[PDB]
Amino acid sequence: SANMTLTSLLHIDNPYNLDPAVLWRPRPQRNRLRVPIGLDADGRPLELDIKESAQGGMGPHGLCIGATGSGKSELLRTLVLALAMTHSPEVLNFVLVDFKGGATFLGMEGLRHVSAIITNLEEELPLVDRMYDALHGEMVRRQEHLRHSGNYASLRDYEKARMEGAPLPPMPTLFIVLDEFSELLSAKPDFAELFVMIGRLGRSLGVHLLLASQRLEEGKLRGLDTHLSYRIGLRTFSAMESRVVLGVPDAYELPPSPGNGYLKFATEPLVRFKAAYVSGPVDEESESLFDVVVRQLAGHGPEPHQIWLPPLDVPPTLDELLPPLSPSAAHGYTADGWEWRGRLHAVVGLVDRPFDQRRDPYWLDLSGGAGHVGVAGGPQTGKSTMLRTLITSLALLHTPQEVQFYCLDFGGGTLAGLAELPHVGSVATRLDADRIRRTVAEVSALLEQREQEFTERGIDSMATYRRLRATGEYAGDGFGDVFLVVDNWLTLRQDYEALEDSITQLAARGLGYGIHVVLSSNKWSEFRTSIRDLLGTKLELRLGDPYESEVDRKKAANVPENRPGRGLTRDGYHFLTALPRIDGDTSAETLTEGIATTVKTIREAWHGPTAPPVRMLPNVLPAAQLPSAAESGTRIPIGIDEDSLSPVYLDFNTDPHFLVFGDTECGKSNLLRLITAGIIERYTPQQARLIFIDYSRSLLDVATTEHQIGYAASSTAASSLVRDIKGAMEARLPPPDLTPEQLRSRSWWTGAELFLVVDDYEMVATSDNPLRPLAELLPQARDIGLHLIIARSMGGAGRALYEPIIQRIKEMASPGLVMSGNKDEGILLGNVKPHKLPQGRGYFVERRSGTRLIQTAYRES
Numbered sequence: 098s099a100n101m102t103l104t105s106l107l108h109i110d111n112p113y114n115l116d117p118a119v120l121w122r123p124r125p126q127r128n129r130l131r132v133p134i135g136l137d138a139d140g141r142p143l144e145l146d147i148k149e150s151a152q153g154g155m156g157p158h159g160l161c162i163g164a165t166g167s168g169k170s171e172l173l174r175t176l177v178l179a180l181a182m183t184h185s186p187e188v189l190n191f192v193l194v195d196f197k198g199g200a201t202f203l204g205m206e207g208l209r210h211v212s213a214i215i216t217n218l219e220e221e222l223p224l225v226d227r228m229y230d231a232l233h234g235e236m237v238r239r240q241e242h243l244r245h246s247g248n249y250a251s252l253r254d255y256e257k258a259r260m261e262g263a264p265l266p267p268m269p270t271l272f273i274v275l276d277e278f279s280e281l282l283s284a285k286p287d288f289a290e291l292f293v294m295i296g297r298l299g300r301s302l303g304v305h306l307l308l309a310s311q312r313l314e315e316g317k318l319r320g321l322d323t324h325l326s327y328r329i330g331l332r333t334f335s336a337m338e339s340r341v342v343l344g345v346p347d348a349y350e351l352p353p354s355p356g357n358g359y360l361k362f363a364t365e366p367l368v369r370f371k372a373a374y375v376s377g378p379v380d381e382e383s384e385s386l387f388d389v390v391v392r393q394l395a396g397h398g399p400e401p402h403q404i405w406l407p408p409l410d411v412p413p414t415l416d417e418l419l420p421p422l423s424p425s426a427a428h429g430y431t432a433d434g435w436e437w438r439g440r441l442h443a444v445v446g447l448v449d450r451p452f453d454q455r456r457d458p459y460w461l462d463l464s465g466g467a468g469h470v471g472v473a474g475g476p477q478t479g480k481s482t483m484l485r486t487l488i489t490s491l492a493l494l495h496t497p498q499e500v501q502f503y504c505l506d507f508g509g510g511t512l513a514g515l516a517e518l519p520h521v522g523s524v525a526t527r528l529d530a531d532r533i534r535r536t537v538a539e540v541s542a543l544l545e546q547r548e549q550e551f552t553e554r555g556i557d558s559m560a561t562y563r564r565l566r567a568t569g570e571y572a573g574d575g576f577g578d579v580f581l582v583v584d585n586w587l588t589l590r591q592d593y594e595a596l597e598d599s600i601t602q603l604a605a606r607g608l609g610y611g612i613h614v615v616l617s618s619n620k621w622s623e624f625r626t627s628i629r630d631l632l633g634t635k636l637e638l639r640l641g642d643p644y645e646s647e648v649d650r651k652k653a654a655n656v657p658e659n660r661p662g663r664g665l666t667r668d669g670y671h672f673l674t675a676l677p678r679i680d681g682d683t684s685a686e687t688l689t690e691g692i693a694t695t696v697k698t699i700r701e702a703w704h705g706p707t708a709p710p711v712r713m714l715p716n717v718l719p720a721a722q723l724p725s726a727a728e729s730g731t732r733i734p735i736g737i738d739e740d741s742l743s744p745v746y747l748d749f750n751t752d753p754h755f756l757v758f759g760d761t762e763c764g765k766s767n768l769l770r771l772i773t774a775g776i777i778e779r780y781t782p783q784q785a786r787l788i789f790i791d792y793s794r795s796l797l798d799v800a801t802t803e804h805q806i807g808y809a810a811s812s813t814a815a816s817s818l819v820r821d822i823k824g825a826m827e828a829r830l831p832p833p834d835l836t837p838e839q840l841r842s843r844s845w846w847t848g849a850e851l852f853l854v855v856d857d858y859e860m861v862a863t864s865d866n867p868l869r870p871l872a873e874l875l876p877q878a879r880d881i882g883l884h885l886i887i888a889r890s891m892g893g894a895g896r897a898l899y900e901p902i903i904q905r906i907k908e909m910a911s912p913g914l915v916m917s918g919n920k921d922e923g924i925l926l927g928n929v930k931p932h933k934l935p936q937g938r939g940y941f942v943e944r945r946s947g948t949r950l951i952q953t954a955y956r957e958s
């Protein structure tokens with residue numbers, strides 16, 4: 098027995114001129130799914146009929162065993178190719194599976210019969226579980242098709258009803274060839290359930306299975322030995338393996354030459370045969386016969402139903418998951434005229450649904466309820482990338498007047514690439530602490546504004562507000578839907594604990610007023626229990642721990658460790674985050690160049706008002722911007738705070754004294770002239786008078802008025818001015834028997850109040866301090882008309898806190914200001930230790946409102 102060509106057994110004279118029309122002709126009931134595989138001893142061809150026993154013979158399913166060198170690989174090629182040359186893709190589809198990296202089905206791709214070639218599963222082991230659901234889904238799909246089409250019971254009933262005289266789609270029988278199923282089950286033994294289900298359903302569903310392995314052990318065929326009708330035994334490894342698949346050890350004794358084997362079915366005798374080949378040439382009195390055949394058959398017939406889809410390797414882009422994007426008129430670069438534009442929906446990635454034999458785009462409904470977005474994942478998992486997609490995705494479906502973004506980049510500084518977007522208004526890095534506080538303060542203010550205004554106007558919900566601005570006839574707040582983005586929440590609740598509770602309350606009531614938070618961190622446990630529950634839309638990636646997950650502990654573990662972008666959809670499915678690109682390139686190494694081009698496209702397509710910036714404390718605040726005397730009253734504005742950028746006042750009718758510390762050239766003398774000038778504009782010389790102690794002579798600009806009483810530039814002139822004002826205020830001291838009314842009205846004395854303005858107190862606080870005698874009057878300064886306004890340098894200020902004058906001023910809780918300095922001096926006033934501050938800036942300390950960062954005003958001349 099030499100070796101014969103398959104073209105010979107199929108009665109084909111000319112292989113180089115195949116006609117698919119005369120190959121896929123309607124075959125008789127017996128010849129259906131019946132092809133020759135080789136010749137027997139006598140010389141008669143041996144046919145394999147994989148039809149059910151009730152229709153033909155050798156049952157629906159079968160098994161093939163053959164050790165290395167038995168031609169197991171070549172046999173499987175011959176069987177498939179023969180079936181392909183005898184049937185149309187209309188009536189037959191293949192699922193070719195090899196557990197190990199075998200090139201058995203290499204070249205089968207061209208055939209329209211082949212739905213999927215699943216090779217090499219020993220490596221990416223979880224693919225087995227996917228392949229389970231992909232096939233399990235096919236079983237259910239075929240069944241529901243038979244339940245729906247009519248109420249048929251089997252494919253055969255369906256098929257010829259269809260071909261009898263009916264209108265139905267062709268439903269081809271499915272042939273599944275799984276190689277090395279033995280070492281597959283020894284890897285994932287739970288997979289055997291699929292096999293059993295096939296043996297239970299496959300006959301009616303038209304699904305035929307062929308289990309092939311290099312070597313077998315008897316345990317593997319548990320609950321399968323019955324369903325496997327025909328058995329092809331090539332040269333086995335042991336005598337027992339030959340037995341468990343045939344009943345006799347005859348396969349062990351087969352010649353080492355490949356091609357020889359036996360064929361057992363039911364109770365009918367073995368038939369030794371010799372398989373034909375397809376991997377050779379043909380002669381006459383290079384290239385294989387396989388290639389020649391496939392080359393001609395490829396491209397003919399209906400393309401098969403996809404059972405297996407590309408298993409989540411290369412990430413998609415935003416243009417890939419969205420309709421064609423075009424520069425619209427007064428709508429920017431967006432999906433012009435799309436139904437889902439400006440619906441607060443955003444596409445993020447691609448979800449894998451293998452059971453449903455499809456892959457869905459992942460969409461988020463930030464239109465309320467789930468408007469808050471949370472992201473978690475271990476180091477280098479793909480967070481910072483995820484955020485950039487979500488922002489860009491929203492940026493593509495919305496105009497900068499509809500959405501705004503304010504970011505706190507605490508995870509890599511990658512967000513700075515989107516800073517030129519018209520949708521963003523601020524991108525604060527970890528080094529810009531001033532902008533970080535303001536970014537949160539700005540949104541906090543907007544929330545409070547919308548909290549009141551929405552009730553004042555006829556606005557019942559944020560949906561209405563969005564609908565009002567949509568008319569293009571309403572301005573509102575100047576904002577739309579605002580998104581506060583934090584890259585690393587952990588970093589935030591460490592360096593800025595105060596902002597944790599701040600942003601938390603933003604989330605607790607912001608969704609109803611169009612304020613969204615988009616927070617990201619490493620672990621869900623890094624989010625406090627109070628705020629973690631507020632994140633409606635959670636986007637979970639690969640975690641450092643599969644537990645602590647917010648979807649499924651189990652599933653979380655199956656998420657690829659070192660494959661960035663992979664995650665777990667809320668429904669419990671694997672997905673892959675898209676890339677923030679609209680170019681089309683899906684390569685992560687050229688991401689930087691990609692993002693920059695996307696932002697460039699969106700910005701240049703938008704020719705309107707951009708996102709409102711985060712306003713901050715001015716480097717220089719003009720005193721003219723402060724409320725006038727006719728506005729404030731007797732109160733004197735000195736600057737604005739960081740909290741709400743609102744004026745900060747000093748009311749000398751409530752607290753009589755004021756004290757300010759600060760290093761050299763910080764703004765002491767300027768603040769002193771500012772406060773003084775405020776007194777001039779609000780008091781008449783018969784209401785309040787001034788006395789200056791200015792050794793450095795910095796206060797000449799404000800000592801020219803009629804209020805001026807005494808000006809001292811020397812220690813002698815200073816202490817001289819103390820003697821006469823001491824005895825003066827001593828005269829105003831309350832008589833013992835005064836009624837409470839007389840006390841609070843200050844009736845027993847008349848005249849003006851005295852404002853003692855002292856600049857450079859460190860230079861006047863020598864061994865013999867001129868201000869010392871007045872120390873005993875400072876507590877009684879309220880019952881009289883005394884006021885102390887003192888400025889002192891930073892050096893040795895901490896130890897000066899114990900001086901009689903200052904120690905009593907601080908004791909009676911006088912308003913104070915701590916400007917630029919160092920921490921060596923310790924806490925001077927309030928609860929904040931001094932540090933390097935820009936000119937004019939300081940920490941305003943008041944008994945009420947406590948400590949507050951403010952910016953003092955600059956007064957020229």
Ligand SMILES: Nc1ncnc2c1ncn2[C@@H]1O[C@H](COP(=O)(O)OP(=O)(O)OP(=O)(O)O)[C@@H](O)[C@H]1O
Binds near residue numbers: 685
């Ligand atoms: N969906 C994706 N597809 C392909 N590559 C990705 C994807 N997501 C992230 N990457 C790659 O992973 C790298 C890290 O991304 P990213 O900075 O988002 O992770 P991270 O968790 O924020 O890192 P870190 O924890 O250090 O801040 C990037 O260089 C990017 O190229």
Ligand SMILES: Nc1ncnc2c1ncn2[C@@H]1O[C@H](COP(=O)(O)OP(=O)(O)OP(=O)(O)O)[C@@H](O)[C@H]1O
Binds near residue numbers: 716717765795
């Ligand atoms: N409120 C302010 N805002 C911005 N800049 C200011 C303010 N006040 C002062 N400056 C700047 O600081 C510089 C010094 O101001 P000022 O004379 O108040 O310092 P000082 O407290 O008197 O220090 P020194 O006692 O060492 O002179 C000035 O050149 C001025 O431009």
Ligand SMILES: [Mg+2]
Binds near residue numbers: 480481507509584
């Ligand atoms: Mg990061």
Ligand SMILES: [Mg+2]
Binds near residue numbers: 765
């Ligand atoms: Mg000064």
